[PDB]
């Protein structure tokens, strides 16, 4: 009645478990599960992704969306969306006319898991997943919570 609702009414893992807990295998055993998964790739599962009773299917610890190879980092432009961050990855471009570098800033967008604890201005590890929309091809994995500022703040990272 709190997180099951969310204005559009189905919040289930792909393995239904909830109503048939009364079946006499898992309950005299212990198979009463929120869907438990590791992402792998040198990470650790956060505790709200261990037992946190929110349900989303684009979650990398609850759903089936996975990560492969390529790993990314970056700082969030606008945290405030419906669970999607936007990354401004800057880099130093080598202008051959000037024989120099310059700033060139880019914008990603990553689907957010309700597991971790969010900041705006933090340095966020994201990962390549299957394209779950146009711009959201990534997923939020691990936060380095830093006090970096807004648009004025710069670092190639």
């Amino acid at each position: 009645l709190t997180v099951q609702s969310e204005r559009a009414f189905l919040k289930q893992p792909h393995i239904f478990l909830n109503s048939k807990v009364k079946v006499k295998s898992t309950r005299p055993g212990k198979g009463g599960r929120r869907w438990y998964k590791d992402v792998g790739l040198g990470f650790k599962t956060p505790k709200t992704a261990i037992e946190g009773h929110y349900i989303d299917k684009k979650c990398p610890f609850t759903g089936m969306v996975s990560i492969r190879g390529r790993i990314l980092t970056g700082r969030v432009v606008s945290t405030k969306m419906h669970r999607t961050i936007i990354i401004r990855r800057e880099y130093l471009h080598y202008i051959p006319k000037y024989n120099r570098y310059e700033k060139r800033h880019k914008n990603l967008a990553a689907h957010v898991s309700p597991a971790f604890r969010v900041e705006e201005g933090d340095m966020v590890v994201v990962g390549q997943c299957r394209p779950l929309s146009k711009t959201v091809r990534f997923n939020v994995l691990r936060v380095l919570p830093r006090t970096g500022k807004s648009v004025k703040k710069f670092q190639k990272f």
Binding site: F9, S19, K20, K22, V23
Partner: protein, 201 residues
């Protein structure tokens, strides 16, 4: 004749992009099967790799799952109750996935009375006919089905009110226009108060 691709759009910056090619036959989107209840009307639409796709336009029946026992009985469909997408699809009673359909509790209830030995879905007049309810107990069948009669013959009482209605709240998890059938499982408990609460809404 109907398109699917990602290029007939506007950009993430917003400017519409000049299309650089014409439509090629791998970017097709086909017509949805607004599946209705009745006779068996079938398109078989042969798709990529020689793999013919079961297109169910009109259907009658299909087996459902009794989730708290793993029992599967073939069941005739009655009607759509709720869909979180479209009250036009409820308003035409169009079948789809995530559609809760009230169903026939006759094959389920006759596995219940063919197996357990307990009444549900009956009036307090308690009428009864021929004997298969008792047909012959043994000492082994007496201890067996009486030992199963002792505790686990048990129901959510709102589901019991839908045995008295004889028409339960199942959910469709298959899609008809790509599998040729409209099947699902039975909704129990917190989801029963959830979607019966959507009948309340």
């Amino acid at each position: 004749g109907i398109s699917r691709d990602s290029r007939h759009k506007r950009s993430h910056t917003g400017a519409k992009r000049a299309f650089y090619r014409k439509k090629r036959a791998f970017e097709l989107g086909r017509q949805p099967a607004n599946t209705r209840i009745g006779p068996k009307r079938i398109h078989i639409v042969r798709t990529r790799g020689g793999n013919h796709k079961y297109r169910a336009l009109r259907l009658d029946s299909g087996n459902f799952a009794w989730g708290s026992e793993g029992c599967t009985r073939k069941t005739r469909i009655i009607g759509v109750v709720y869909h979180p997408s479209n009250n036009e699809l409820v308003r035409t009673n169009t079948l789809t996935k995530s559609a809760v359909v009230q169903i026939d509790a006759a094959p389920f209830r006759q596995w219940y009375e063919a197996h357990y030995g307990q009444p549900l879905g009956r009036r307090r007049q308690q009428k009864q006919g021929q004997v298969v309810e008792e047909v012959k107990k043994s000492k082994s069948v007496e201890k067996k089905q009486a030992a199963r009669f002792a505790a686990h013959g048990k129901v959510d009482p709102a589901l019991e009110k839908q045995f008295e209605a004889g028409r339960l709240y199942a959910i469709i998890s298959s899609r008809p226009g790509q599998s040729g059938r409209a099947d699902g499982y039975i909704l129990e408990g917190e989801e029963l108060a959830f979607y019966q609460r959507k009948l309340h809404k």
